[PDB]
Amino acid sequence: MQLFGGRYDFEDTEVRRSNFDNFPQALISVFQVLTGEDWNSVMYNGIM
């Protein structure tokens, strides 16, 4: 939340559900990365 919270302001219409905008969504994203499923997409979103 500190790092990627509120920084997903991309001008395109692509939807990125796995973000860190609030605590429940950050928890869901962290759990998803923990399971290892599609964590590289979250990493790419954080990088961009």
Added chain:
Amino acid sequence: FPSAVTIKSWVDKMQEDLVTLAKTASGVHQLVDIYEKYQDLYTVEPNNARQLVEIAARDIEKLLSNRSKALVRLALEAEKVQAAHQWREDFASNEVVYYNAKDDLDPEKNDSEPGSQRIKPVFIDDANFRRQVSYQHAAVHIPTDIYEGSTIVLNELNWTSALDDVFKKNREEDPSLLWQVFGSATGLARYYPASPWVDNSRTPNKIDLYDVRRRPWYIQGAASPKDMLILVDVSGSVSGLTLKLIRTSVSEMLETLSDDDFVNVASFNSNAQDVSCFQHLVQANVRNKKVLKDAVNNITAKGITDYKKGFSFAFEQLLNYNVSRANCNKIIMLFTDGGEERAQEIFAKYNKDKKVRVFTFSVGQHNYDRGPIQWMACENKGYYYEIPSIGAIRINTQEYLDVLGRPMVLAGDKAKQVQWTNVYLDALELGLVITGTLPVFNITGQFENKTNLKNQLILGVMGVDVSLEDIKRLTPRFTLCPNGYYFAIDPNGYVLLHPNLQPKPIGVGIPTINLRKRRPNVQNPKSQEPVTLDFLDAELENDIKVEIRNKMIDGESGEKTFRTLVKSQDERYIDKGNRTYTWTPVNGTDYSLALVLPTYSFYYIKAKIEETITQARYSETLKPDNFEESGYTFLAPRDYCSDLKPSDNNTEFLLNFNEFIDRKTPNNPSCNTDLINRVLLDAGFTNELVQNYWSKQKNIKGVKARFVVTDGGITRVYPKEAGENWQENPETYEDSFYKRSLDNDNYVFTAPYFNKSGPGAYESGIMVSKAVEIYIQGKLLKPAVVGIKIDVNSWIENFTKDCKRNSDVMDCVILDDGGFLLMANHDDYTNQIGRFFGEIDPSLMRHLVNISVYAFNKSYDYQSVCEPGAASKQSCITEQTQYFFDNDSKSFSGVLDCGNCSRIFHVEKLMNTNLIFIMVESKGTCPCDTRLLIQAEQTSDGPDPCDMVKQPRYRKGPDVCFDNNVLEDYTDC
């Protein structure tokens, strides 16, 4: 250097030779004599500039009243029929039968859409419609993204089927009716006669974007003028998708405004400010809207939201009253995502009486609270909208006109006044049209006042199109001089009628394209703006012209005679001539009609030929068989009658004219007798001139061609071999040299074009023409213009025989007014003949402009074809320059210096001619050059728009409009 007297002797000899050659070759005196020799085959009739304008205004008022009568009929029938609707929900059993536009015409399509049945029309070809139309029913247009077959749509098609009878009744009452359409509030458009849509849904690779709710006529007839202030949130939270969506939505809503609405865009992020250089409400025309769009598509999201400051700024700018305003509908458009403050105290301070509507828009997908903005919406008598994606922008940025129409509905029959739109291009490719509009109200349970919930909204807008060509038929011009014309004005400055008004859309700014971001299969939108050209932008603006325009905007009748600058038809020359402006208002409408009549045009020649044999001889003079005897003959493609039509091909048009006039008698049961009689009389006169005088000297040394151009539309070029070198319009009223010779009182030399394909420099020669002036009973008349084409080589031998061929010491050239080259001395400038002198000798031309031997002034062309730059053809603004003589003095002398040089020059003006003689030092003596002086259409972006808003042109908006009704419920958001 030669003395002044020697140069005077040279120029006197040259001008005497040229004038004698032109006079004895063209034969002005002979034509004047034979015009004065008869005085019995015609009569001189006055041109009363007062009565003509009154007659034309009465005709225009009668036409518009006829169009308006067909509007109230349709509106009343639609209201009555919809009042008796049942709103059934089961359409599968009872199919709705209609002809859907933009559908495949192949009968084997087997659509079989549930609840509906299609129609296959015949689509015969028709006049007054350059399409295929069917008079048996009406066509229905449904927007592509609106699904036909819905309960709402099918119900509309059910009760709108009763409009076909009234459509047919209106058409049979007046067979000249163009498109008459019902624009439904549900998106439907039913128009008569039936005709296939220009753009199918997906049959070609192109698609269509046409919603009747966004058309200018629908918007005009759906509500009153607005004082809109768009408020944009640019705080940090709107960063990302929602900011781009907000920008697109603001542009789309700006596209819904007209010239009667006033708008300004402001942004707030902890501080409120304007987005452009306007700082207050502006007229919201094409230029101002372009500026606002450009400013809007530059905002960035940064900071903390503050609704109080933004709303204070919006209210203060809505309370200005210092500037021009619509003064009708003060509304605020708030674009944001979400918030937590509602700014109750700001609304209590600024909008306690609730005179300002607040429309709130929640844009994008977000988790922010939307309650406060809904409270703002349906607290200040407004509405609340949501725009989650691009697909919702168009639908949600046009719905606010439903709320604005509630007081107009509650007014009742006081609001059913027919309004006429600005000039725009018809969507069905009919040309420049204006549309009369009339709202249609929902009256369900009117006698009992049962529901009154949805009845506050309109059913739709009536519409009838009137082509600008119909109005031109009511203002005939062939009894006037080619310099005379009619023109009409809005109470906004825009011209309904003008010779300089063209079907091209109005260009704004400079066109820039990015070809690297253009997919080849996208079908980008083309245009939707109207053709709004001001009176001052259609002619050369003048101080007296501004006074006349202001006087005739506010319904006054008057007359003025003055001296003004007149631009030639080809934008190369400017002339000085007397003109008389006579204007009167049109009672039925807010239009004002004026007639511009120069001197020497108060009288015209009316043919009085009443002998069959004389008419037969005059008709057989203009036959292709004896073009070797009477010269090559051209005929103006005028509308003599509907039996024969113009074809833009003079040979076949002349053949059809001859065959029609020889087949049936000239008794003309349904043909215009005056035009044919004038044509025959002038053809006979020109044939007599050719046979009696021109044929005596078959070949002349210095003359390459001889031509005579008269009124009525008769043009003769004596050598048939020179007939193929004639590149002028067969219509004599569109000949630039004809009008220039009419204005001038001497011989006019027309410079040939440059960088143009076809023989136009040497094989044709320089053209000099003079206007024929006759005196019948002390009345000045200029019926014809004659002239010759002189050989360039013969003129070269004249000129050279100091000033010697290819001289390295002295340069001697001849120019006409306008700065174009007609004679040289070095056989280098001679090849580049007809060029502006500033493009071959910029220093001398600039100095000539400085010493005031050449005058110039600039103007803007708002309908031009432009090549799009990098940041096929697009429309923009081109700046035009034309040079002319200003000083009456004949001789100038001086020395020009450029980098420690000294070149002695002595320019001399040839008497009784628009020519000038220049004798200057060779350019090779001092190799100095700063920059070329270009006289050509240059792509331009001016004038500066947010400098004209401070001192705008005079305007007179509508006086009656409806808002703030007490009976409005306003319980929706």
